[PDB]
Amino acid sequence: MENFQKVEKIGEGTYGVVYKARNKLTGEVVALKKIPSTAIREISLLKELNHPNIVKLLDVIHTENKLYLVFEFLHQDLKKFMDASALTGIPLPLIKSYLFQLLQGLAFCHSHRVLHRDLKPQNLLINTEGAIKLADFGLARAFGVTLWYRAPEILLGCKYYSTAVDIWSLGCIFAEMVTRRALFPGDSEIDQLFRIFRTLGTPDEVVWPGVTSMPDYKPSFPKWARQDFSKVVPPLDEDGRSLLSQMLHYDPNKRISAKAALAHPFFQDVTKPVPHLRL
Numbered sequence: 001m002e003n004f005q006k007v008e009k010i011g012e013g014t015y016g017v018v019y020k021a022r023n024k025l026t027g028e029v030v031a032l033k034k035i036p037s038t039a040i041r042e043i044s045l046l047k048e049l050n051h052p053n054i055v056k057l058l059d060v061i062h063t064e065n066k067l068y069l070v071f072e073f074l075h076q077d078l079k080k081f082m083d084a085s086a087l088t089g090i091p092l093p094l095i096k097s098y099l100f101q102l103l104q105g106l107a108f109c110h111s112h113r114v115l116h117r118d119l120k121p122q123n124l125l126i127n128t129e130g131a132i133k134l135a136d137f138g139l140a141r142a143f144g145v146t147l148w149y150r151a152p153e154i155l156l157g158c159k160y161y162s163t164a165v166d167i168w169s170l171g172c173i174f175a176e177m178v179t180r181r182a183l184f185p186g187d188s189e190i191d192q193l194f195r196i197f198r199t200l201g202t203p204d205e206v207v208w209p210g211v212t213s214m215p216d217y218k219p220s221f222p223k224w225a226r227q228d229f230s231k232v233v234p235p236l237d238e239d240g241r242s243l244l245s246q247m248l249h250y251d252p253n254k255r256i257s258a259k260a261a262l263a264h265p266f267f268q269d270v271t272k273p274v275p276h277l278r279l
């Protein structure tokens with residue numbers, strides 16, 4: 001760590017503090033994250049998981065029995081950009097470009113059986129050229145709190161969840177870019193679950209076979225009727241609403257994959273616009 005000079009704190013999460021820092025030897029500006037042998041091996045395999053829509057994990061430093069993750073630095077997160085664009089809204093062609101790129105990132109990681117498990121606007125990073133990238137893929141499994149983007153199977157206590165949890169989180173982020181408001185802003189596990197039920201309907205064996213046998217399912221859950229997406233994400237067009245509905249299916253087996261989402265008609269006219277970034 002004597003080779004790195006901290007510039008400023010850019011994040012604080014479950015694992016640890018994230019700093020913007022300068023590599024004293026190369027002159028490189030990086031994102032430095034300060035955090036078991038199985039963890040060293042799993043993180044070292046993530047170093048080889050390279051894609052245009054994944055934040056590059058440059059180095060894993062295991063010195064003085066402490067762990068540091070050195071990432072490439074991007075100039076802003078999606079959270080700051082959504083807050084900066086709250087008065088006008090992010091242009092729909094830019095929303096579409098970012099969703100398309102994040103699905104490409106997900107399709108790549110998922111093909112390598114790597115899950116994110118905690119997607120949120122704070123770990124989606126953007127640059128001046130129009131790219132968007134996912135950060136912290138595979139760190140949840142390797143090392144073994146906002147609930148707004150949590151898939152219903154995680155909230156109902158499924159221990160062996162799938163890549164579908166990331167499609168759910170990304171659907172929630174898509175809705176939030178379009179409407180400029182969090183889709184399900186729960187402040188407790190039960191509030192999160194009941195916010196999902198109040199919008200999409202209380203799940204049952206018809207729409208989600210096996211739901212009533214899930215570890216934290218209670219027959220005493222209130223029964224709420226489902227709402228129309230036209231009410232949930234106005235002014236999104238029918239292609240966008242259809243794709244969103246498939247990303248938010250209750251049954252993880254019915255939920256669209258990232259690979260299938262890339263073929264959705266909503267992306268017929270996708271482009272790569274330039275964002276207006278204030279750095």
Ligand SMILES: Cc1nc(N)sc1-c1ccnc(Nc2ccc(N(C)C)cc2)n1
Pocket residue numbers: 010011012013018031033055071072073074075076077080122123125135136
């Ligand atoms: C790996 C990682 N984890 C996080 N919590 S931010 C992060 C990361 C990785 C690469 N670039 C960046 N840039 C960045 C720049 C500015 C901010 N302001 C808070 C807007 C945040 C992140 N963060």
